[PDB]
Assembly symmetry: C3
Homo-oligomer: 279 residues x 3
Amino acid sequence: RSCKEIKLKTKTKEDGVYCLQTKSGQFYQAFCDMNTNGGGWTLVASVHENNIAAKCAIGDRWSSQLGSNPAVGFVDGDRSWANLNTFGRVESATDDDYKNPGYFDVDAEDISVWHVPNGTPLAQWKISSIFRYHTATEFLTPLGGNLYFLYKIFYPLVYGSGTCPASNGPAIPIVYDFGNTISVASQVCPACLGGTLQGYVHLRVFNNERAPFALCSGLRVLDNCNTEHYCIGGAGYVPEQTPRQCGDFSAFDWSGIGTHVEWSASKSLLEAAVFIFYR
Amino acid sequence: RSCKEIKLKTKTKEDGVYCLQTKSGQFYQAFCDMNTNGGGWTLVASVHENNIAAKCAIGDRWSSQLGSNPAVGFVDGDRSWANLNTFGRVESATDDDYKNPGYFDVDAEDISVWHVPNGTPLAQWKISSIFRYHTATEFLTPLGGNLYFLYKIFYPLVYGSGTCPASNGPAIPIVYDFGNTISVASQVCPACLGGTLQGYVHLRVFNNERAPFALCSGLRVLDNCNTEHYCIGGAGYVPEQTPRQCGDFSAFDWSGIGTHVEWSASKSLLEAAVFIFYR
Amino acid sequence: RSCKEIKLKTKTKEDGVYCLQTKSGQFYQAFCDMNTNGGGWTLVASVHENNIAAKCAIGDRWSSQLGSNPAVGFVDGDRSWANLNTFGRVESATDDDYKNPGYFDVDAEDISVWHVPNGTPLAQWKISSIFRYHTATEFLTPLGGNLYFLYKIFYPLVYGSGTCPASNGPAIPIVYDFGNTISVASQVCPACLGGTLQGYVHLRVFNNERAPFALCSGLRVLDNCNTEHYCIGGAGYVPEQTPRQCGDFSAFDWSGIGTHVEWSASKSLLEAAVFIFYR
Ligand SMILES: [Ca+2]
Ligand SMILES: [Ca+2]
Ligand SMILES: [Ca+2]
Ligand SMILES: [Ca+2]
Ligand SMILES: [Ca+2]
Ligand SMILES: [Ca+2]
């Protein structure tokens, strides 16, 4: 049902694709990592950005595909963070979004996160990745066991029904597998660090506009509610300069693509699919 | 090749996913139901509505995805009712449209229909469903054996090439597996019942505008040609108040979503994926 | 890993679907042809056109899905010719685009091309096809072994970075498996032949506007740079009468659909999915 038990019964197993099945019984294939900290991490999702200029258009499966509309039928986006919809396949996880049943079925304790440059074939994924970390606090069990139930518990990613830090989500300390806080500070915007703290993963942050964002990889949000620039995923509506802040990678191009200025992420991060692993 | 033979050779089998193959030989997995009336029903399709406000937009795979355009290249929609295109996977059949090869390959005698609330995991599908029925007239054999050939025989779902009841499709009497005619009358619009009769499934009805609709689940159409409000699927063009009548669930929101008024379906039906089974 | 070795170890095998795996190990199914010139051709792609009137819209996975935009994030299209993204399934390869891992993994010497009318079930593919040819020059080995590496070598299909014939791609002589140069001259536009020569396949031609097109099936381009009318695929931007020249089948409808006049392809070719095989 996961790569963890595969590592458990069968010790010497290594990285690669394995056959798994949901407990309801449908088969699928998942990329098991078996070397990271005892191994056993199952790849369950990937947040790829095909076009930073396309503001909630085709391919922004994680935020919205029909635009940024505040209508009652639009503010919930695609719910791809909190629904059973699955898409993409394994070896294309670095060229377009990917999500397999293991996202919601497999129960887990910790999540691991990789940043892999787009276009990277499978055999390079671990060595070509620029950032790799994972949590070690077993925080998923009180939250339902996976991110699906984590977004049934606080939060349903709904626009407007919260506020910045007063209503933010959890902030989990991470351990670095590849990369370091200096590199973290080198990949995010310059004005990023003025309101964050490296070394944590943050789930369901609220921006200044009450719009919720799923994930902030690498840093915990401080009292700075300009979170559209360093957190990915989201709902289907953001009102500040709409729709310049829509997409899988919400506003990483505020001041120009990859130019790495006050509000612009480094180019190395604009081309980085964010792999999510369960254990 | 189907779940019927699986039930035949191997008796005691129950609900769940099984491995099947088309006669051309490609493998797939299908959810076999084995308790309904001797069992043996294969799940072959699912008409999910992700956004009732999106009029022939992304996700309306059963009616049209490019809008309601009367141009010569547009009036045929996506033909997903009468083509070999397949999409989605099994356990996501309750969060987005689903269709597997068994739709056109497997020959069958009867169809079964379920209404399952969106977001329902597989293990709940039968018990959480609100409506379940099936035909018992073996009407698919004269029509080619499945719905694909049923839409090669009358009708190619083409706009304009017919009229209401004078050119309507078949009306098959159904037996109720869960639900009853009172509940049926409770789920459809109020002004619905003024022109229909419970207890039948109707295929290829024509609306007042000559636009054809694939399926009317639960009721047979009378001389009332306002069929956009209780029949799903369709072609790529409907001219009355275009495009307020486009989508997988064509006009179930004419007078407000789920408000259950003169032309509005009950909320319980707006969130209901329509599962189709073959036998 | 391909159908070639399946033909090699196991002689008498015939046309049909077989199980293959990438060298990284993920399984898939591919349609192996085993009769063409010793057989062993693996079906790896299919360029289907669902709507000639939709100019770079949903379903034009090979050229662009977000329109014809000259913005820096748009001129590269979807890169589906040169990325690991895969989509569609086998038996639907004649109703919508299709591409499997064998596109980029399998190394090959020659390519075969079929034109199959849309809606054709699998069992008819070979006999219902109108054109079938294949190269016999083993030209893929110097280019990386497949079309993916062929579009890492010249050319990255990028708009503007070339010109017509001075910077065109390779022109490979083909042998005819079904069809002949008279039929070829009968399927393309009338004003087509005034600037081409039958009997070659041409990869990465540049149109008069420096926009690059992936493939010209059946003919080699002469000094005529009006290539938008007989070459398929492309990038995400064409500037002449934008966007009347966008789509999988770029401009085969310049003077009316299927009307077979000066700039219009024959109707038999407008409904023809282009199957690509490796060996
Ligand atoms: Ca994306
Ligand atoms: Ca802000
Ligand atoms: Ca739908
Ligand atoms: Ca009406
Ligand atoms: Ca296409
Ligand atoms: Ca031209």
